[PDB]
């Protein structure tokens, strides 16, 4: 069983190298991980948190669960990352979501794609939970419409391809629920709304939450594998960081 | 693809799938000649079945489960040097 995983990783690293060369030659479709299951099998998602999570972090995970139609929340009590990921792959899950916080303030968001990656880590800013909204009510859990704005670079498409597959395919045409991710200077503002088609336009209503996510690590492997080779990383001490844009 | 299939297929590719060739890649044996001796003596099992013929080619799905036989004196050596001989498993 370990031998099979070792072999598959080598094939995978070879595949991305071949895919990378093909793209570079084209420089002179859906990614290989998701091409097999794109639009065929709906995603299977687990959302969890760090050990001894604060009450707010548990609340935030529930909100992320409600965001994703096929998400299931799992308590991380004493689970070990190999033990977590192995237990996850057996059940057949597609993605794993793990959250961190600071004094009940969500801080980071990491997404790892099974069986073999990639793994993307995000940092959260201006997080506004729905529980902060009084008398808000319950969400709608229909398959929502997706909006991807200002993703231009090759990495931007990669971030799109990762994020896009977390949802179920083929939302019904008049679905009132829409999720939007707007890139603004590598800072993706995540918003979701419920709209009503009026006779003279569209009216939208926020249900919450609000948060800004920035990719800072994208790695060709599962989150457990701290040995895996890095596809891309965010350089902060470079002299051009204060004005460099990537997405 | 088919045009690849015309030229990709080679004798070396078929020889690569030879069980004597394979475990050498798996590092069970130093050398192909050491390998053919072991298989003839009957220490190497593919899945639940024992193979004594060197010319067997292992298909990919069976590639993972090629291994020694439980009561092999070789395996008894394997766990002995690393000091994990467990006599309940008789290996």
């Amino acid at each position: 069983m370990l031998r099979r995983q070792a072999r598959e990783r080598r094939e995978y690293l070879y595949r991305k190298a071949q895919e990378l060369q093909d793209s570079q030659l084209q420089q002179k479709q859906v990614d290989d991980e998701y091409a097999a299951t794109s639009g065929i099998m709906d995603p299977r998602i687990i959302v969890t948190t760090s050990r001894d999570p604060s009450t707010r972090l548990s609340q935030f995970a529930k909100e992320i669960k409600l965001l994703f139609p096929n998400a299931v929340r799992l308590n991380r009590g004493n689970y070990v990352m190999p033990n977590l990921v192995d237990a996850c792959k057996k059940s057949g899950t597609t993605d794993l979501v793990v959250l961190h916080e600071h004094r009940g303030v969500p801080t980071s968001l990491t997404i790892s794609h099974f069986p073999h990656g990639p793994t993307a880590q995000f940092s959260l800013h201006n997080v506004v939970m729905r529980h902060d909204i009084i008398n808000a009510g319950n969400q709608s859990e229909v398959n929502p419409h997706l909006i991807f704005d200002n993703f231009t670079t090759a990495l931007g498409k990669r971030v799109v391809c990762i994020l896009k597959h977390l949802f179920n395919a083929g939302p019904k045409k008049d679905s009132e629920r829409v999720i939007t991710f707007a890139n603004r200077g590598d800072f993706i503002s995540v918003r979701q709304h419920v709209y009503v088609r009026t006779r003279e336009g569209v009216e939208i209503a926020e249900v919450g939450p609000r948060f800004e996510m920035r990719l800072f690590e994208l790695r060709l492997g599962t989150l457990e594998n701290k040995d895996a080779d890095v596809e891309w990383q965010l350089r902060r001490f470079i002299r051009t960081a204060n004005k460099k844009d990537y997405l | 693809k088919i045009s690849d299939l015309e030229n990709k297929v080679t004798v070396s590719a078929i020889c690569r799938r030879r069980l004597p060739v394979i475990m050498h890649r798996l590092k069970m044996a130093e050398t192909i000649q050491d390998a053919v001796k072991f298989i003839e003596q009957g220490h190497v099992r593919v899945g639940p079945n024992l193979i004594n013929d060197p010319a067997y080619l292992v298909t990919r799905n069976m590639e993972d489960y090629v291994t020694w036989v439980d009561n092999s004196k070789i395996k008894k050596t394997l766990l002995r040097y690393r000091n994990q001989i467990d006599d309940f498993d008789f290996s």
Binding site: L2, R3, A6, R9, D227 | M23, L26, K27, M28, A29, E30, V66, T67, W68, I74, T77, L78, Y81
Partner: peptide, 19 residues
């Protein structure tokens, strides 16, 4: 070295090991 440790074949056998 870490990668070698991960993808180690448990079935690998050697002769000088007999010593």
């Amino acid at each position: 070295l870490r990668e070698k440790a991960k993808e180690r074949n448990p079935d690998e056998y050697y002769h000088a090991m007999h010593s």
